[PDB]
Design a protein around this motif. Sequence first.
Motif, PDB file in Angstrom:
ATOM      1  N   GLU A  84     100.854  69.685 -52.275  1.00  0.00           N
ATOM      2  CA  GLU A  84     100.904  71.001 -52.869  1.00  0.00           C
ATOM      3  C   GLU A  84     101.935  71.817 -52.087  1.00  0.00           C
ATOM      4  O   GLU A  84     102.445  71.358 -51.073  1.00  0.00           O
ATOM      5  N   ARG A 145     110.277  72.614 -58.146  1.00  0.00           N
ATOM      6  CA  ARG A 145     109.292  73.220 -59.022  1.00  0.00           C
ATOM      7  C   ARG A 145     108.561  74.337 -58.279  1.00  0.00           C
ATOM      8  O   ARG A 145     108.305  75.418 -58.824  1.00  0.00           O
ATOM      9  N   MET A 163      97.420  81.227 -53.259  1.00  0.00           N
ATOM     10  CA  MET A 163      96.951  80.096 -54.058  1.00  0.00           C
ATOM     11  C   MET A 163      97.806  78.876 -53.755  1.00  0.00           C
ATOM     12  O   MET A 163      97.293  77.780 -53.500  1.00  0.00           O
ATOM     13  N   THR A 169      91.248  72.445 -53.504  1.00  0.00           N
ATOM     14  CA  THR A 169      90.186  72.301 -54.483  1.00  0.00           C
ATOM     15  C   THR A 169      89.709  70.864 -54.490  1.00  0.00           C
ATOM     16  O   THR A 169      90.375  69.965 -53.963  1.00  0.00           O
ATOM     17  N   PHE A 300      96.340  77.623 -65.694  1.00  0.00           N
ATOM     18  CA  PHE A 300      95.316  77.444 -64.644  1.00  0.00           C
ATOM     19  C   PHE A 300      94.031  78.232 -64.866  1.00  0.00           C
ATOM     20  O   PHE A 300      93.660  79.050 -64.027  1.00  0.00           O
TER      21      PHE A 300
HETATM   22  C1  LIG Z   1     102.078  74.550 -57.440  1.00  0.00           C
HETATM   23  S1  LIG Z   1     100.560  75.453 -57.466  1.00  0.00           S
HETATM   24  C2  LIG Z   1      99.805  75.197 -59.052  1.00  0.00           C
HETATM   25  C3  LIG Z   1      99.139  73.889 -59.284  1.00  0.00           C
HETATM   26  N1  LIG Z   1      98.339  73.695 -58.144  1.00  0.00           N
HETATM   27  C4  LIG Z   1      96.934  73.869 -58.228  1.00  0.00           C
HETATM   28  O1  LIG Z   1      96.400  74.180 -59.297  1.00  0.00           O
HETATM   29  C5  LIG Z   1      96.193  73.655 -56.957  1.00  0.00           C
HETATM   30  C6  LIG Z   1      94.788  74.131 -56.826  1.00  0.00           C
HETATM   31  C7  LIG Z   1      94.593  75.020 -55.651  1.00  0.00           C
HETATM   32  N2  LIG Z   1      95.029  74.357 -54.455  1.00  0.00           N
HETATM   33  C8  LIG Z   1      93.156  75.393 -55.531  1.00  0.00           C
HETATM   34  O2  LIG Z   1      92.586  75.285 -54.421  1.00  0.00           O
HETATM   35  O3  LIG Z   1      92.528  75.795 -56.540  1.00  0.00           O
HETATM   36  C9  LIG Z   1     100.121  72.777 -59.321  1.00  0.00           C
HETATM   37  O4  LIG Z   1     100.992  72.780 -60.167  1.00  0.00           O
HETATM   38  N3  LIG Z   1     100.042  71.718 -58.356  1.00  0.00           N
HETATM   39  C10 LIG Z   1     101.010  70.664 -58.362  1.00  0.00           C
HETATM   40  C11 LIG Z   1     100.870  69.519 -59.306  1.00  0.00           C
HETATM   41  O5  LIG Z   1     101.399  69.578 -60.447  1.00  0.00           O
HETATM   42  O6  LIG Z   1     100.233  68.486 -58.957  1.00  0.00           O
END
Ligand SMILES: CSC[C@H](NC(=O)CC[C@H](N)C(=O)O)C(=O)NCC(=O)O
Length: 439
Positions: A84, A145, A163, A169, A300
């Motif tokens: 992440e 990205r 976030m 998560t 999200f």
């Molecule tokens: C770049 S941030 C948005 C989204 N990431 C999450 O949704 C992560 C969850 C967050 N860490 C949480 O604790 O809810 C995401 O696109 N992650 C990268 C991916 O495509 O795997």
Amino acid sequence: VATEPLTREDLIAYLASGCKSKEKWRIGTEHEKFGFEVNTLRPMKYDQIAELLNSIAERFEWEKVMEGDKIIGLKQGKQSISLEPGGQFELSGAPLETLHQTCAEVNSHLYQVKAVAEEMGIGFLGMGFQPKWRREDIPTMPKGRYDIMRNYMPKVGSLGLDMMLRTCTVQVNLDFSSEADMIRKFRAGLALQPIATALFANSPFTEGKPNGFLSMRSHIWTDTDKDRTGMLPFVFDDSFGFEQYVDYALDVPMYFAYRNGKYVDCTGMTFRQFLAGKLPCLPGELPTYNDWENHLTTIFPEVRLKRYMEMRGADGGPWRRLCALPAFWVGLLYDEDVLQSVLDLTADWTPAEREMLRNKVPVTGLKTPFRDGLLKHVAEDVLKLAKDGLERRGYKEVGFLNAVTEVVRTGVTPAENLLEMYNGEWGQSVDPVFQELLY
Ligand SMILES: CSC[C@H](NC(=O)CC[C@H](N)C(=O)O)C(=O)NCC(=O)O
Ligand SMILES: [Mg+2]
């Protein structure tokens, strides 16, 4: 015509092509972890992450995933390891038939990561929010990205960067058999998501001190971006189905379009513009199914819909809770009678009550007042249903809910237990949490 442009109906059919008969339903589990230097507690840096990924690849036979000249992840079969924005170290597991397989997969990954990491003096911490370090203290990963998103977040909220950099998560991905089934699972999942957030709340600390929340992680998702988050009340409208979700997603602003290995910044624009060949970042270009999948993956909400359904409400945590999170939802949604019972239990909850639970749980957990009682009392009934659902599956998986049983019985969240330690034996330092919650 040779290539007819995608139509709204095709975008609908893309989602609907996820429908699977019951015998084909599977369980995917994803979770994220904070890496840190054992000696200083500092967040793990990209150069350390690259050594870790390369060593895991060589030792355990994973293929290396690159962006440019930088190793960003690994893939083995239907598993992948990814990063992440703040270096959080994620496993996206394979679609699996039983929760016994799920937990074995968690264990295997944790074993491999530790086998390499312990030689590097690196540990991993399961928690919903980085307890010690400031936003500016977090390394940022070399992913285009993420560069686009980091530049955008400040425009839509004050917490979105947290976030990205500071949260972890554990999520479960589940299948539906039809539109009617998808609607029922979406409504059960949204109504109950705050109960899951409460059971799993583990993020009481910011920058070495209690922050006033049980799950600060969940709170962060209410200040991230209003266009892409929340309890999606329209899902509970009579009109709701695949078509309405598609219209919702069409009007969520884009992040990026991926073209010839590169991320094009599309912020400020919508996929509905793209569909009409009106997207300014790519003049006259028309979208593909990859573009649509990519856009769906930038939304999200507390529950997300794609060709499968994602339960997004839970804080990262120690391994027994990593195995408990998928078990909770499988027990609730994968048995038709239990699913009906969940819909019955929640049938009279108003949009305003669902939103209130979502906003209050991050502060008060199972002690959040609800109607005649506390959310704790709803959770007693919900946990009973989840356990019934696992009993009925007949795979002897019910034990995976042992990890949340005492939480529900006592109404005390994992976050509240950490606060008692902090004000207890830890002598009001967060430092010992890097031991307590060490994987
Ligand atoms: C770049 S941030 C948005 C989204 N990431 C999450 O949704 C992560 C969850 C967050 N860490 C949480 O604790 O809810 C995401 O696109 N992650 C990268 C991916 O495509 O795997
Ligand atoms: Mg992730």
